[PDB]
Amino acid sequence: MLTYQVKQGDTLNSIAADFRISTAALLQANPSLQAGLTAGQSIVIPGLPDPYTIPYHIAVSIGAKTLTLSLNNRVMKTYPIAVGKILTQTPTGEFYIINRQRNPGGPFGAYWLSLSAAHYGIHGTNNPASIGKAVSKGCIRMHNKDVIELASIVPNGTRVTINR
Amino acid sequence: GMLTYQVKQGDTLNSIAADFRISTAALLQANPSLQAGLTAGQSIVIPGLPDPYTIPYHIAVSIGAKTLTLSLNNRVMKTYPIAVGKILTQTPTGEFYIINRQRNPGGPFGAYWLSLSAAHYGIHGTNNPASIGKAVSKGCIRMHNKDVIELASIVPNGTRVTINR
Ligand SMILES: [Cl-]
Numbered sequence: 001m002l003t004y005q006v007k008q009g010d011t012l013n014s015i016a017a018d019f020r021i022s023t024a025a026l027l028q029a030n031p032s033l034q035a036g037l038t039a040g041q042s043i044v045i046p047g048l049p050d051p052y053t054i055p056y057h058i059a060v061s062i063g064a065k066t067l068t069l070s071l072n073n074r075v076m077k078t079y080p081i082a083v084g085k086i087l088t089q090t091p092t093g094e095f096y097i098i099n100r101q102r103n104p105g106g107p108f109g110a111y112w113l114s115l116s117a118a119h120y121g122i123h124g125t126n127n128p129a130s131i132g133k134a135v136s137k138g139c140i141r142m143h144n145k146d147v148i149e150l151a152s153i154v155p156n157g158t159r160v161t162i163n164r
Numbered sequence: 165g166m167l168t169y170q171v172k173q174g175d176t177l178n179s180i181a182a183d184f185r186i187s188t189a190a191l192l193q194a195n196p197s198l199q200a201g202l203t204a205g206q207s208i209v210i211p212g213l214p215d216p217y218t219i220p221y222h223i224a225v226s227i228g229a230k231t232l233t234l235s236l237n238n239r240v241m242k243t244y245p246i247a248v249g250k251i252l253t254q255t256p257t258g259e260f261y262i263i264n265r266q267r268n269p270g271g272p273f274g275a276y277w278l279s280l281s282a283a284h285y286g287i288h289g290t291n292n293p294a295s296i297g298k299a300v301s302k303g304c305i306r307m308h309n310k311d312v313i314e315l316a317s318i319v320p321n322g323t324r325v326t327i328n329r
């Protein structure tokens with residue numbers, strides 16, 4: 001099961017928001033939390049497949065404006081993306097796909113895939129000219145046809161590694 | 165004066181820069197000591213903004229009440245209905261500041277966007293007035309367009325925004 005290391009400053013609700021779960025679910029999965037939330041301790045995040053057995057991996061290059069989908073550490077597809085503006089960048093680091101919603105429409109296009117950072121995700125677009133540019137509030141945007149392909153394949157729990 | 169931020173473990177130059185909508189160059193320039201490392205608990209300067217404690221306005225947001233209250237010199241002057249984040253994508257709680265603003269961004273953001281000191285979060289208008297008063301957003305605070313215009317025309321960047329469950 002997916003684990004998370006508690007950081008100084010974390011709260012039950014800040015963690016819940018990153019992982020798109022209720023505090024009820026968070027507490028149910030972690031009886032230890034009754035004793036208090038303490039930095040350095042590990043907790044389990046409910047609602048996800050075991051990420052260790054997921055053969056898919058997503059790698060994002062902010063600099064190259066590309067997203068690669070790999071299966072068994074070999075590349076299946078490569079897509080161009082939009083990324084965050086220079087003052088509102090897409091964050092670098094290690095994330096997970098948490099959930100997805102079909103056809104959110106509007107600026108989100110054909111799919112929204114939640115990333116394990118509050119408010120961040122991978123989604124479609126109503127604005128094709130934005131793809132390939134640093135123009136977003138921080139999300140990764142793809143052409144609708146591409147995010148549909150991506151969502152149709154990858155399970156929740158899939159790792160998303162974002163690099164410069 | 166200058167606004168200050170207290171570093172927490174896990175913070176990076178980039179994460180802080182994203183929260184305060186500044187470049188890492190600006191952050192570093194204002195804090196020459198950071199090159200030697202970030203330590204939890206240290207206070208750093210955030211350029212481009214005044215001392216928030218010099219601004220006489222204070223905004224209080226209640227997620228429960230679905231209200232944003234504006235105070236001046238610790239007197240309540242106006243209260244507005246707001247939309248807040250859905251249960252799985254809640255509005256974050258704590259102490260924030262208004263960081264910058266953009267007039268008439270349009271789309272779901274309506275007549276105004278005010279950035280809050282958490283990356284991707286802000287107070288903004290809406291092209292969906294029915295949503296105001298409900299827990300329906302990805303995490304932002306939404307107001308009626310006329311309300312966010314009014315709020316934005318009163319309060320300056322750096323204004324303290326306290327968000328309570
Ligand atoms: Cl968004």
Ligand SMILES: [Cl-]
Binds near residue numbers: 137
């Ligand atoms: Cl937004």
